[PDB]
Amino acid sequence: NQYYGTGRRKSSAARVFIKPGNGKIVINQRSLEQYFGRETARMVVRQPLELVDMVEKLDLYITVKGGGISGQAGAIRHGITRALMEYDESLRSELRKAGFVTRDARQVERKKVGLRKARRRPQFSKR
Amino acid sequence: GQKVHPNGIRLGIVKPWNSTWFANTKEFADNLDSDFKVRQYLTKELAKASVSRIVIERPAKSIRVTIHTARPGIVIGKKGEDVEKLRKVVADIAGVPAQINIAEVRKPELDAKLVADSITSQLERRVMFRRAMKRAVQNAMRLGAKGIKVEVSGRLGGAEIARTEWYREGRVPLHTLRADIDYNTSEAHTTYGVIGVKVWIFKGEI
Amino acid sequence: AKQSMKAREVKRVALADKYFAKRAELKAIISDVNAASDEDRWNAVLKLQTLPRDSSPSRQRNRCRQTGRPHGFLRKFGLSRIKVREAAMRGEIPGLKKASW
Amino acid sequence: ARIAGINIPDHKHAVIALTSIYGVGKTRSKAILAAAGIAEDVKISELSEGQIDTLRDEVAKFVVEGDLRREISMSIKRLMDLGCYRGLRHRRGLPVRGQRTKTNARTRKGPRKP
Amino acid sequence: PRRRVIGQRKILPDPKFGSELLAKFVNILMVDGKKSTAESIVYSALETLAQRSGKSELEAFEVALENVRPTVEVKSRRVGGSTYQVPVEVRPVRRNALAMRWIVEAARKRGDKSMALRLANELSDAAENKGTAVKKREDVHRMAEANKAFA
Amino acid sequence: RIRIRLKAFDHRLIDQATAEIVETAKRTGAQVRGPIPLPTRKERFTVLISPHVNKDARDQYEIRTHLRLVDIVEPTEKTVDALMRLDLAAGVDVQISL
Amino acid sequence: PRSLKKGPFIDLHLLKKVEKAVESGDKKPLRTWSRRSTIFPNMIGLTIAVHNGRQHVPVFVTDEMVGHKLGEFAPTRTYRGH
RNA sequence: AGAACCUUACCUGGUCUUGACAUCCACGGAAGUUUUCAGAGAUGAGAAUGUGCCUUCGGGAACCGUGAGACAGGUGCUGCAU
RNA sequence: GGCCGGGAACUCAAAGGAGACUGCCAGUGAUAAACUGGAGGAAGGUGGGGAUGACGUCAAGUCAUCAUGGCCCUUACGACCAGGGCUACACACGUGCUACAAUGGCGCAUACAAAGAGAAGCGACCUCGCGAGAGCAAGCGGACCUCAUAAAGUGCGUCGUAGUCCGGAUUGGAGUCUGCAACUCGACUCCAUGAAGUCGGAAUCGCUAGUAAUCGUGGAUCAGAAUGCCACGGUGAAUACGU
Ligand SMILES: [Mg+2]
Ligand SMILES: [Mg+2]
Ligand SMILES: [Mg+2]
Ligand SMILES: [Mg+2]
Ligand SMILES: [Mg+2]
Ligand SMILES: [Mg+2]
Ligand SMILES: [Mg+2]
Ligand SMILES: [Mg+2]
Ligand SMILES: [Mg+2]
Ligand SMILES: [Mg+2]
Ligand SMILES: [Mg+2]
Ligand SMILES: [Mg+2]
Ligand SMILES: [Mg+2]
Ligand SMILES: [Mg+2]
Ligand SMILES: [Mg+2]
Ligand SMILES: [Mg+2]
Ligand SMILES: [Mg+2]
Ligand SMILES: [Mg+2]
Ligand SMILES: [Mg+2]
């Protein structure tokens, strides 16, 4: 059947279904290149599969919403990693060593009262 | 002025709200204003009735007022005329049928509002302020309190230079939100101006 | 606020709901394009300004219901920022607690 | 390349070159070009005298260069002798459309005098 | 800083060439968070460097870095009221950081039509040791040679 | 079928409200769709705490309006009076639809 | 400025003040406080004493100053250099 | 956390003095609705039509207006009394 | 076409829980506290960010939120009104916004958010208008409807380094609509105009990662009137040798 993984990254949530296949990737009813114009976004969703040299043995059906190009790509790659361990638990060790298992918890720091941004203060004058 | 209000910081953790009703923005302000008016009138009438907190509920086009007091008999009166006349005038200023329940405070010396009010009355009667503060602190500690802090500010004894005197016996952890801190204030209107009284009463955690 | 300032606000609200209907239909005549005779619109704007100025809702400056403060007002509470904070800290505003996220 | 009594630049796209006419911005320039059936991107140099001539009378529908610059000066002069607020602001070289004069206002007042 | 010792942030390598070093150079050239705009600039500039040199993008880039990498730098230090410039050996990671920064600032300054052209031109001149970035590395080596009396 | 939308400022109060109302159902009327949570409205406020001229001194408050939807379907027409006539808790707003 | 569909604004009392003024041919200044009324062709030739906050400045209405408001011809701030 | 009027506290000139806001008041009176003239508006002068209280009823009101006064009113000063 | 039947898987929502505790391993340490690594784990050590501000200090700020002692005015220092002003303008500072461009800006096409707000309110659709907006008019007290098409981004053209197709201050017309009223003294639109400015002296500020920088979004106030304030997301760095 399908091996599912959820991937979250920076307000993006991905839904990754993997199947034994000839190698083909559709995300949001679109191919990888149709969806992610960014070249570094190309790599990110490919990073797990290239690492486990399983790029052609699996077919990926992915849905993602929220966030932006890098947020969705990182969430997609995180969801692939989860589904990849669902496919084969033994692969966790190599995926963790690559740094893909960890959920990236970096989030947009809130704006603070008295601060123009999360940390940027207004210009300070001595006198 | 650098301490968070002890009640407000604990409003969701340990302390409850004094107004527990729901409204949309259309009538939220009106309910809030009428709540203020009934509390304002009730404290004015029950000044000598030793009222600690007035709880307002508004279920289904009706106002339910729970008056916590250490003198329920004086609040209720003979056969309940005083609460009945209160119910009439509370209804006609809130605009809805009213129901006045009366909660009895077991020990008035452990409620911050009544302790602060007692000190304020003493100061307005020209009781020497340190004696009033010591009596309040000792009374709470002996009826059972894990701690009490009393603070008095203003022209103490008519002194031209205002100062702040405070006594703390026991334990009063204000940074512990789990701690149940009863806090309230009162103002004595002496011949030399306003004297501010603050009372913290610690009654254990959880 | 001064007592007279509070009295001005009360009178303005009273005038604005007394003439609310007349002002509404007068503004309808001026606003209308199809059923808009040039003379008919002309009397409407002349009529509209004969009503007392305080009947216009725009002349109302909503104030803190407890103090009459004309600044830092909140529509949801009908109070100024100062009265909102002390009623919030006293627990007299339902469900309103200090926020953190 | 002598529309409206001035020499519009060559070597530039007709839209850009045409806006050198005082009184023709980008909106009028592309309106004149479309009405004259000339593509926007073509250079003025590559235009033929026939194409340039239909441009000549196309901008003749718009008050441009001297006559427009007379009426704006007429309109400002109009205010100045009228004695209105706007005229007085024009007299003193101060902002006319209600901008602040406590600070800024340098465009109307020039560089700081002290 | 005073106490807390930093573990290095990890940089994902560039897509086209899979280089850790090149990805850092894109970061050096990135402005305003526009990494996509920076990525195209150095990808364009690298391939004209390849065509106009003869080697691959990485080899051509490495040649330019080698001619700009400093070895010793000065730092204004203090003993008493001294304020001398003290020559110190640059650690290998800072050598690449300084070379990339010097190339990027030189490329920005040398006015051309495009930044990729600017970057390609300066990268080429660095390869033949004529660039302004090479000039700045000469100044640093010259400045640290004058003050070699301190250590 | 007939939907009950409950909104209150306290989530424990709303959970108690939903718990009893669906156990008022399942006896007089069964097959409840369960209390759907629905997003909670976090209406935030930011006020100046100082009486005068301390702009960076602010208190940030919020009112969390918790929502609940039960969506009781298959009514027995003697579950309707059980659902009605209930006056459960003040501070909970009950909306009756269809 | 003011929408064309709503016409010009002239406050009613001033409008009927110049009504009798031109009807009677009276030439005495019309003391008004309505700086916000637009000039009408009717008022051409009249002299209007327009308030400026302190004084009623007399403005002789001419045909040229028709689409303007009374206040434009009565500056309120007095300033002559620093 | 938002000066066109309002806000508004400023000032120019138009006004009122138990007052705009209160409570006792004492009398007369439904108030509150629609209009007109003068006025820049405040306001003043009118024209109608409204006669409801709710009821130990006759009369408390809920208020409207004059007339006495206690008083009200002050974003006036002192944050170096609080 | 989640469009339909359906399904309760998934995302998500919001309640309740688990989880992280130096818990375990190794070394160092006074056999202590603890520290340094490692494993595991989503997270490793106060994980990130808030709230939370001790005794006191500055007679710090606020009698103009409010309250208040004491003074002071009481046919005025109170009260009402229309008009002005608070928006002035030889200057000088603070804080910002927009730029001086090609990592751009102009056109066309095309992706990906979050968080909010709505009943005299938000206001689809359709029609009219170059446009601001007008009509008509559903729906929505809302995970439903509306505000509301995110923009940087990407793709393809163009410009060709010039005070320019940069910049968009002025200033003339003409218009919208909010409100009794846009003159003083608004916001917006359209046509025209196209200033200073080519990166800023002495000096000086903020920021240690989703941070800075940059890009949009909306809401409190609010009839109307943000480049301010308060929030929200999108892309996303550099560097920390060290004292
Ligand atoms: Mg961000
Ligand atoms: Mg600030
Ligand atoms: Mg207003
Ligand atoms: Mg008030
Ligand atoms: Mg031109
Ligand atoms: Mg006024
Ligand atoms: Mg004013
Ligand atoms: Mg005044
Ligand atoms: Mg005064
Ligand atoms: Mg002080
Ligand atoms: Mg103080
Ligand atoms: Mg703590
Ligand atoms: Mg002082
Ligand atoms: Mg002071
Ligand atoms: Mg004014
Ligand atoms: Mg000001
Ligand atoms: Mg909502
Ligand atoms: Mg230009
Ligand atoms: Mg830090």
**B166/B186 Cα distance (integer angstroms):** 14
Judging contact as 3 or more Cβ pairs under 8 Å, the answer for B and F is yes
Name the CA radius of gyration of chain F, rounded: 18
Q: Report residue B2 as tokens.
A: 């650098």
F77 touches chain A (CB under 8 A): no
Secondary-structure breakdown of chain D: helix, strand, coil percentages, each rounded to the nearest 5: 55, 0, 45
Q: Nearest-CA neighbor of E38 among E20, E18, E21, E24? A: E24
Q: What is the DSSP letter of G69?
A: B
Hey, is G15 helix, strand or coil? Answer: helix
Hey, is B194 helix, strand or coil? Answer: strand
- Evaluate whether B17 touches C95 at the Cβ level (below 8 Å): yes
Q: Report residue D71 as tokens.
A: 């009426």
CA distances, A121 to each of A107, A112, C100, F51, F57 (Å)? 20, 10, 20, 24, 15
Q: Report residue C3 as tokens.
A: 């007592």
Phi, psi of A44 (to 5 degrees): -60, -45
Which superfamily is assigned to E20-147 in CATH? Ribosomal protein S7/S5 (1.10.455.10)
**A45/A83 Cα distance (integer angstroms):** 13
Instruction: Give residue E63's region: left, alpha or beta (phi > 0; psi -120 to 50).
Output: alpha
- Evaluate whether E140 touches E70 at the Cβ level (below 8 Å): yes
CATH number of the CATH domain containing F23 = 3.30.70.600
Q: What is the DSSP letter of F54?
A: -
Q: Which long-range contacts (CB under 8 A, 24 or more apart) does E52-60 make?
A: E52/E120, E52/E124, E53/E124, E53/E127, E57/E16, E57/E17, E57/E22, E58/E17, E58/E19, E58/E22, E60/E123, E60/E127
- Evaluate whether E70 touches E90 at the Cβ level (below 8 Å): yes
Burial of B167 (0-12, 13-18, 19+ CB in 10 A): middle
Q: Nearest-CA neighbor of A92 among A103, A102, A101, A105? A: A101
Spans of all domains in chain B? 16-106, 107-206
CA of F64 to the centre of ligand 17 (A): 12
Cβ neighbour number for residue E52 with a 10 Å cutoff? 13
- The resolution in Å comes to 2.3
Please provide the distance, in angstroms rounded to a whole number, between the alpha carbons at the two ends of chain E.
Answer: 23
Which residues in E6-45 are b (16+ Cβ under 10 Å) and which e? eeeeeeebbbbeebebbbbbbebbbeeeebbebbebbbbb
Contact residues for A44 (Cβ-Cβ < 8 A; gap 6+):
A70, A73, A74, A76, A77, E12
Q: What is the Cβ-side half-sphere exposure of residue D97, based on CA atoms within 13 angstroms? A: 3
Torsion angle (degrees, nearest 10) of CA D95, D101, D105, D106: 120
D-G contacts at Cβ under 8 angstroms: 15
The residue behind tokens 């009033």 is B132
Helices (H), strands (E): how many in chain C?
A: 4, 3
Count how many domains chain F has. 1
Contact residues for B99 (Cβ-Cβ < 8 A; gap 6+):
B62, B63, B64, B65, B87
Q: In which domain, by residue range, is F25 found?
A: 1-98
Which run of H or E residues covers position B25? helix B25-45
Q: What is the DSSP letter of B62?
A: -
**A112/F60 Cα distance (integer angstroms):** 10
Hey, is G68 helix, strand or coil? Answer: coil
Strands C73-74 vs C79-80: parallel, antiparallel or unpaired: antiparallel
C92 touches chain B (CB under 8 A): yes
**F83/F20 Cα distance (integer angstroms):** 10
Q: Nearest-CA neighbor of A11 among A119, A108, A112? A: A108
Chain G residues within an 8 Å CB radius of D82: 64-65, 68
CA distances, B121 to each of B188, F24, F89 (Å)? 7, 52, 38
Q: Nearest-CA neighbor of E9 among B57, A99, G11, A28? A: A99
Q: Nearest bound ligand to CA F55?
A: 2
Cβ neighbour number for residue E69 with a 10 Å cutoff? 18
Which run of H or E residues covers position F78? none
Q: Nearest bound ligand to CA A121?
A: 2
- Evaluate whether D37 touches D68 at the Cβ level (below 8 Å): no
Q: What is the DSSP letter of A102?
A: S
The structure was resolved experimentally with cryo-EM
- Evaluate whether A75 touches A6 at the Cβ level (below 8 Å): no
Q: What is the Cβ-side half-sphere exposure of residue C24, based on CA atoms within 13 angstroms? A: 6
**D63/E111 Cα distance (integer angstroms):** 42
| Identity at C76, one-letter amino acid code | K
Q: Within 7 A of a protein CB, which nucleotides of strand I?
A: 9-16, 40-44, 47-57, 59-62, 64-70, 78-96, 102-104, 111-120, 134-135, 141-143, 150-155, 158-161, 164-165, 169-187, 190-196, 204-214, 220-224, 229-243
Q: Nearest-CA neighbor of C66 among C94, C86, C91? A: C86
Hey, is F41 helix, strand or coil? Answer: strand
Cβ neighbour number for residue A50 with a 10 Å cutoff? 11
Burial of B202 (0-12, 13-18, 19+ CB in 10 A): buried
| Identity at A86, one-letter amino acid code | E
Phi, psi of D25 (to 5 degrees): -90, -165
The residue behind tokens 């309940």 is B80
- Evaluate whether D102 touches D41 at the Cβ level (below 8 Å): no
CA of A122 to the centre of ligand 19 (A): 16
Burial of C13 (0-12, 13-18, 19+ CB in 10 A): middle
